[PDB]
Amino acid sequence: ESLATQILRRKQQAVWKVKGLAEMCDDDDAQYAARLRLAQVDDNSGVGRAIGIDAETEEYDVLNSDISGVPEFLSSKMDRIVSLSGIHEIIIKNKNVGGVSASQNTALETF
Amino acid sequence: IMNQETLIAAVEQMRKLVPALRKVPDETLYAWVEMAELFVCQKTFKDAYVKAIALYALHLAFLDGALKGEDEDLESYSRRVTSFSLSGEFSQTFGEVTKNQSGNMMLSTPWGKMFEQLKARRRGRFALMTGLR
Amino acid sequence: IMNQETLIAAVEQMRKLVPALRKVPDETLYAWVEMAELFVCQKTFKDAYVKAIALYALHLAFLDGALKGEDEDLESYSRRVTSFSLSGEFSQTFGEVTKNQSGNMMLSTPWGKMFEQLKARRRGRFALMTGLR
Amino acid sequence: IMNQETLIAAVEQMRKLVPALRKVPDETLYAWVEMAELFVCQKTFKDAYVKAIALYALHLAFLDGALKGEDEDLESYSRRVTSFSLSGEFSQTFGEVTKNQSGNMMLSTPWGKMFEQLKARRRGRFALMTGLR
Amino acid sequence: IMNQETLIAAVEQMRKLVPALRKVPDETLYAWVEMAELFVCQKTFKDAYVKAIALYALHLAFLDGALKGEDEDLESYSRRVTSFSLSGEFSQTFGEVTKNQSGNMMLSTPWGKMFEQLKARRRGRFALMTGLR
Amino acid sequence: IMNQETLIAAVEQMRKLVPALRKVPDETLYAWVEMAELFVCQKTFKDAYVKAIALYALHLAFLDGALKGEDEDLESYSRRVTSFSLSGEFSQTFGEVTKNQSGNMMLSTPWGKMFEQLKARRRGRFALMTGLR
Amino acid sequence: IMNQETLIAAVEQMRKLVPALRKVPDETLYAWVEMAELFVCQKTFKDAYVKAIALYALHLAFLDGALKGEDEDLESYSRRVTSFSLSGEFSQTFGEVTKNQSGNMMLSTPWGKMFEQLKARRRGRFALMTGLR
Numbered sequence: 071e072s073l074a075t076q077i078l079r080r081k082q083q084a085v086w087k088v089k090g091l092a093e094m095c096d097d098d099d100a101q102y103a104a105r106l107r108l109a110q111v112d113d114n115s116g117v118g119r120a121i122g123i124d125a126e127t128e129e130y131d132v133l134n135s136d137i138s139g140v141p142e143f144l145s146s147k148m149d150r151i152v153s154l155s156g157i158h159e160i161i162i163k164n165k166n167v168g169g170v171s172a173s174q175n176t177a178l179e180t181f
Numbered sequence: 182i183m184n185q186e187t188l189i190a191a192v193e194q195m196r197k198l199v200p201a202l203r204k205v206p207d208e209t210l211y212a213w214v215e216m217a218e219l220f221v222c223q224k225t226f227k228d229a230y231v232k233a234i235a236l237y238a239l240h241l242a243f244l245d246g247a248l249k250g251e252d253e254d255l256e257s258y259s260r261r262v263t264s265f266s267l268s269g270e271f272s273q274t275f276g277e278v279t280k281n282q283s284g285n286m287m288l289s290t291p292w293g294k295m296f297e298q299l300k301a302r303r304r305g306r307f308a309l310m311t312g313l314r
Numbered sequence: 315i316m317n318q319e320t321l322i323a324a325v326e327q328m329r330k331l332v333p334a335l336r337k338v339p340d341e342t343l344y345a346w347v348e349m350a351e352l353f354v355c356q357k358t359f360k361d362a363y364v365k366a367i368a369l370y371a372l373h374l375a376f377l378d379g380a381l382k383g384e385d386e387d388l389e390s391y392s393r394r395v396t397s398f399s400l401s402g403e404f405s406q407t408f409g410e411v412t413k414n415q416s417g418n419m420m421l422s423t424p425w426g427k428m429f430e431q432l433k434a435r436r437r438g439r440f441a442l443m444t445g446l447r
Numbered sequence: 448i449m450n451q452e453t454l455i456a457a458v459e460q461m462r463k464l465v466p467a468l469r470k471v472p473d474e475t476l477y478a479w480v481e482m483a484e485l486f487v488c489q490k491t492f493k494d495a496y497v498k499a500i501a502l503y504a505l506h507l508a509f510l511d512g513a514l515k516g517e518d519e520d521l522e523s524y525s526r527r528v529t530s531f532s533l534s535g536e537f538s539q540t541f542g543e544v545t546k547n548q549s550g551n552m553m554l555s556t557p558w559g560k561m562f563e564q565l566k567a568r569r570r571g572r573f574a575l576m577t578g579l580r
Numbered sequence: 581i582m583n584q585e586t587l588i589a590a591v592e593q594m595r596k597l598v599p600a601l602r603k604v605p606d607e608t609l610y611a612w613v614e615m616a617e618l619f620v621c622q623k624t625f626k627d628a629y630v631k632a633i634a635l636y637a638l639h640l641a642f643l644d645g646a647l648k649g650e651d652e653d654l655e656s657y658s659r660r661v662t663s664f665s666l667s668g669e670f671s672q673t674f675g676e677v678t679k680n681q682s683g684n685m686m687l688s689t690p691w692g693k694m695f696e697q698l699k700a701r702r703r704g705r706f707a708l709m710t711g712l713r
Numbered sequence: 714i715m716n717q718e719t720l721i722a723a724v725e726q727m728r729k730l731v732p733a734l735r736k737v738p739d740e741t742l743y744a745w746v747e748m749a750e751l752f753v754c755q756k757t758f759k760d761a762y763v764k765a766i767a768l769y770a771l772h773l774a775f776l777d778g779a780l781k782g783e784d785e786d787l788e789s790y791s792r793r794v795t796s797f798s799l800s801g802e803f804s805q806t807f808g809e810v811t812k813n814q815s816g817n818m819m820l821s822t823p824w825g826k827m828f829e830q831l832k833a834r835r836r837g838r839f840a841l842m843t844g845l846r
Numbered sequence: 847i848m849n850q851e852t853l854i855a856a857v858e859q860m861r862k863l864v865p866a867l868r869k870v871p872d873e874t875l876y877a878w879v880e881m882a883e884l885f886v887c888q889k890t891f892k893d894a895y896v897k898a899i900a901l902y903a904l905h906l907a908f909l910d911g912a913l914k915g916e917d918e919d920l921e922s923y924s925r926r927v928t929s930f931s932l933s934g935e936f937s938q939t940f941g942e943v944t945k946n947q948s949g950n951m952m953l954s955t956p957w958g959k960m961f962e963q964l965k966a967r968r969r970g971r972f973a974l975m976t977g978l979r
Contacts, residue, residue, distance in 0.1 A: 086309075090301040092574040095488050101576070104305055109578030111309045122310040126285065197478050199524070200517040212330050219362055220435060229485060244424045245412060246525045251333045258332070259379045260394075261411040261526075268403050274530040278511050282550050284416055286427045291510040294552045302486060463611050465657070466650045495618055512658045527659075537666050544660040545644060549683055556658075557644040560685045568619055596744050598790070599783040628751060645791045660792075673796040677777050681816050690776040693818045701752060729877050731923070732916045761884055778924045793925075803932050810926040811910060815949055823909045826951045834885055 074140050081137060087129040157181070183218050187231060194235045206251075213248070214238050226303045233299055240292040315348055320364060327368040338381070346381065350374045358437045366432065373425035448481055453497060460501040471514070479514065483507045491570045499565065506558035582617050586630060593634045605650075612647070613637050625702045632698055639691040714747055719763060726767040737780070745780065749773045757836045765831065772824035848883050852896060859900045871916075878913070879903050891968045898964055905957040 086108065094101050115121060123130050152159045158181045159165060160174060167174065192210050196202050202210065217238035226233055242248045249257070266272035279289075287293040300306065315321060324347050329335045335343065350371040359366045375381045382390060399405035412422060420426040433439065448454060457480050462468045468476065483504040492499045508514045515523060532538035545555060553559040566572065591609050595601050601609065616637035625632055641647045648656070665671035678688075686692040699705065714720060723746050728734045734742065749770040758765045774780045781789060798804035811821060819825040832838065857875050861867050867875065882903035891898055907913045914922070931937035944954075952958040965971065 088305070088307045090298075090306055091576075092572055093298065093302040093486075094305065094574065095302070096490065096570075100302075100304060102579070104307070105576055105579045107309055108576075109580060111311055112578050114311045119312065122308070124306075124308045126283075127306045128308065197475075198482070199513075200475075201515070201519050201521055201524075203517075205521075209330075209333075216331075216365065219365065220431060232482060232485065241428070243521075243524045244427070246522070247331075247424045248521065249332070249334065250521075253334055255334045255338070256379070256382070258334070259376050259411065260408050263407045263409040264530075265406045266404065269534050271534065272530075272532045273528065275526050276529045278525070278527045282548070284421070286421065286431070288550070288552065291513055294510065295507070298486060298552070463608075464615075464646075465648070466608075467648065467652055467654045467657070471654070498615065498618065509658050512655070515655070535667055537664070539664045540662045541659050542662040544658065554683070554685070557646045560643070561640070564685070565618060596741075597748070598779075599741075600781070600785050600787055600790075602783075604787075631748060631751065642787075642790045645788070647787065649787075663796075668800050670800065671796075671798045672794065674792050675795045677791070677793045681814070687816070687818065690779055693776065694773070697752060697818070729874075730881075731914070732874075733914065733918055733920045733923070737920070764881065764884065775924050778921070781921070801933055803930070805930045806928045807925050808928040810924065820949070820951065823912045826909070827906070830885060830951070 071144065074144065077137055077140065080135070082132065082134045084130070084132050087131070089127040183215070188214055190231050191235045191238070194231055195239060198235065199239065209248075213242055217241050226299070229299075229303070233296060236292050236296045236299070240287075240290050240296060243290055243292065244286075315351055320367075321347065323364045324367045324371070327364055328372060331368065331372065338383075342381070346375050347371045358433070362432070362436075366429065369425050369429040369432065373420070373423050373429055376423050376425065377419075448484055453500075454480065456497045457500045457504070460497055461505060464501065464505065471516075475514070479508050480504045491566070495565070495569075499562065502558050502562040502565065506553070506556050506562055509556050509558065510552075582614070587613055589630050590634045590637070593630055594638060597634065598638065608647075612641055616640050625698070628698075628702070632695060635691050635695045635698070639686075639689050639695060642689055642691065643685075714750055719766075720746065722763045723766045723770070726763055727771060730767065730771065737782075741780070745774050746770045757832070761831070761835075765828065768824050768828040768831065772819070772822050772828055775822050775824065776818075848880070853879055855896050856900045856903070859896055860904060863900065864904065874913075878907055882906050891964070894964075894968070898961060901957050901961045901964070905952075905955050905961060908955055908957065909951075 094104065111121060121130070148163060149159070152162055155162060158177055160177055161181060188211065191214055192207070195210065195214075214234070217234060221230075221234045221237050223230065246261075262275065264272070264274040281289050287297055297306070321344065325340070325343050328343065328347070347367060351367055353374075354363075354366050354370050356363055379390075379394075395408060397405070397407045414422045420430050430439070454477065458473070458476050461476065461480070480500060484500055486507075487496075487499050487503050489496055512523075512527075528541060530538070530540045547555045553563050563572070587610065590613055591606070594609065594613075613633070616633060620629075620633045620636050622629065645660075661674065663671070663673040680688050686696055696705070720743065724739070724742050727742065727746070746766060750766055752773075753762075753765050753769050755762055778789075778793075794807060796804070796806045813821045819829050829838070853876065856879055857872070860875065860879075879899070882899060886895075886899045886902050888895065911926075927940065929937070929939040946954050952962055962971070
C-alpha cells in the first residue's frame, strides 16, 4: 500500500535546466531567492496558465510515467491474506460481489 | 545622472586593470562608461557595482575594435588589414584571437566571459515569469 | 525627427563615439541620421532615444561599406579589393572583419549587437499578439 | 578579502608557482587577486582557500592575454600577431596554445582545469535544488 | 603537513623517473608535490602512495607547459612559438605531441594515463551512491 | 616484486628484445620495470610472467617518449620537433609513427598490442561479475 | 621447452621465405620464435604447425618496425623519419605502406593476413560457448 501511494505521488516530474547553476554559492541569499522564485512559479502554473523562459540558457521538460495494474495487485494480496487466514472474504473484506443475487447465501452457510 | 564619485572610481579601476588606457583622454572613457551604464543593472550586485560596470565597459570597448585612435582614418571600421610588408625592411601578419561558437556576443572577449561568470554567481542567468492576475 | 536639438545631440554623440567622423561633412551625417531615424521607436526607449538613434545610425552606416565619401567610383560598391602591391616597394592584404552566418543583418557590426542588447533590456525581442475581437 | 596576511600568502603562492611574476609590479598582482577573489567560495574549501585563490587568479590572468603590462597599445587587445620577420635577418611565427571547443571558459588554461578538479574533489560540479515550501 | 620523509621519497622518485629534473631547485619541486597532494587520495592505494603521488605531480608539471624556467619571460604562458629561423644559420619547426579526443584533461599526458590505469586497477573508476535514511 | 632473479630475467628479456637498451644505465631499467610491475598480475599468467613484465615495461617506456635520458631539457616533454635544418648543409623532418584514434592507451605501441593479445589468450579481456549475497 | 628441431625448421623456413633475414644473428631469431610460440595454438593445425608459427613470428617482427638493428640508436622507437636531404647530393621521402580500417592489428601486415586466412580455413574465426552444468 505504501509503495502504491509513492507510485501515485511520483506520477509526474518537471525538471528545470539552467546553464551555470553550479556557480551559485551554497546557502546564500542568491540561492534562497532562486529557489523561492522557482516555488512561486510552481504554484501559479496550470492548464490555463503559461510560463516564459529564456531560449539560450534555460530548458523546461516534463517526464511522466503511467499507473496501471496496481488495484489488481492489491486485490491479489488481499486474496492471499484471505486464503492463509482461513475465513471467507465476505467476513474479512466486508465486500459484496454484486454480480449475483443470492449466491452468497452459500458462502455464509459455508462460514 | 549616475554618481560622479562612482564614475571616477570605475574609470580609475578600468585604468588599473588595463594599464594601456592611461594614455587615453578622460572624456572618451567617460562617454564609454556612461554608455555602458545603460546595460548594467544596479540592485542585482549592489556590493560590487564598480567592478562589474568597469568589466562591462571594458568588454564594450574591445568588442570588435570599436575604440580606435583619435586620428585613425575612416574605412578601417569596416575592413581589417590582414598583413603588410615593406620591400626589404620588415613584414608582419595578423589574425583573430579566438573564434566564437554560440553567437551570444558575450563569450567573445575575456572581459565579457568574466562578466557572465560574475552575473551567474551573484544572481544567475535564469528568467522565469508568469502572468499577473 | 520633430525638432533640431535632438539632431544636434545625435550627431554629437556619433562624433563622440567615433572621433573619425569629426572630419566628415556635416550634411552627410545629417542625411544618414535622419534616414536611420525611420527604424527606431521613440516610445520604446523614451529616455535614451538619442543613444539609440546614434547606435542605429552608426550600425546602418557600416554594414558593408556605404559611407565611402566622394571620388570612389562605382565598382567599389559591388566588389572588394583583397590585395594590392606596388612593384617591389610594398604590398598589402585586406580581409573581412566579421562573419555573420546567422543572417539577422543586425549581428554584422558591434553597433548592431549593442543596439539589440539595449532593445532587449528596454522592451524585448519578442512579438506576441492575438487577433482583435 | 577580509584581512592582509591572506593576500600576502596568495601573492606569494602565485609567485612560487610561476617565477616570472617576481618582476611584475606588486600593485597589479594585488588588484588581480582581489578582483579574482569575487568568484571563489571560502566556505567550500575552508582549508586550501589560498591555493584556490591563487589558481583562480592565475587562470583569470591568462585567458586570452590580459596581463600585458604597460606600453602595449590598444590593438593588441583585439587581434593577435602570427608572424614577424625583419628583412633577411630572422623570422618568427606564433600560434595558439590550447583549443577550447567545449566552451566552458574554464577548460582554456591548465590552471582552470586544476581549479575545476580541485572543486570537484572538494565539493562537486553539481547543483541539485528544490523549491522552498 | 604531510610527512617529510614521504615528501623526500616522492621527490627523489620523481627525480629518478625523469632524470632531467635533477637541475631544478628543490623548493619548486616541493611546492609542486604539496599542490599535487591535494588531489591524491590516501586510503585508496596506501601501499603504493609514493609512486602514484609522484606520477600525479609529474602529470601536473607537464600538463600544458605549466612548469617553465626561473627566467622565462612572460607572455609565453598564453602564446606558443610554432617556428623560428635565423637568416642563413638554422631553422626549426615544432608541434604538439598528441591530440586529445575525450576532454578529460587526464588522457592528455602519458603520466596521467598511467595514473588512470593504476587507479582503475587498484580501486576503480566507478561511483555508486544512495541517500542516507 | 618478491625477489631478485625475476628482476634479472625481466631486464635480460627486455635487452634481448631491444638491443638498444644494452647501453642504457641499469638503474633506470630497474626503476622502470619495478614501477611497471604494479599493473601486471602474477596469478593470471603464472607461466610467462617475466615475458608479460618485459612487454608491459617496454610498452610503458614508449608511450609518447618517457625514457629520454639525461640532458634533454624540460620542453621536450610537452612539445615535439617536426623539422630541423642547418643553413644550406642538410635538413630533416620527423613525424608520428602510430595513430591511436581508438583511445585505449594500450593500442599505441606494438608492445601494448602484443600484451593485449597475450592477455586475451591467457585469461581474456572481459569482466563479468555479480553482487555478493 | 618447445622441440629444438621444430624451432630449427621454423627459423630456416623464416629465412627461406624472407631472404633478407640471413644476415641476422640466430639468437635474436630464436628469441622472436620463442615469443611467438606463446600465441600459436598447437592442436588446431598440427599438420602445418611450422609454416604458421613462422608466419606469425614474421608478422610480429614487422608489425611496426619492432625489430631494429643491433646498433640502432634509441628515440627512433617512438619517432619516425619522414624525409631527409643533404645539400646538393641526394634527397628522399618515405611513407607508410598501407592504412588499416578495422583496428584488429592483424590485418596490418601481409603475413598477418596470410595467418588469418590460414586460421579461417583450417579451423575458423568463430567462438561459441555455453555454461557448464
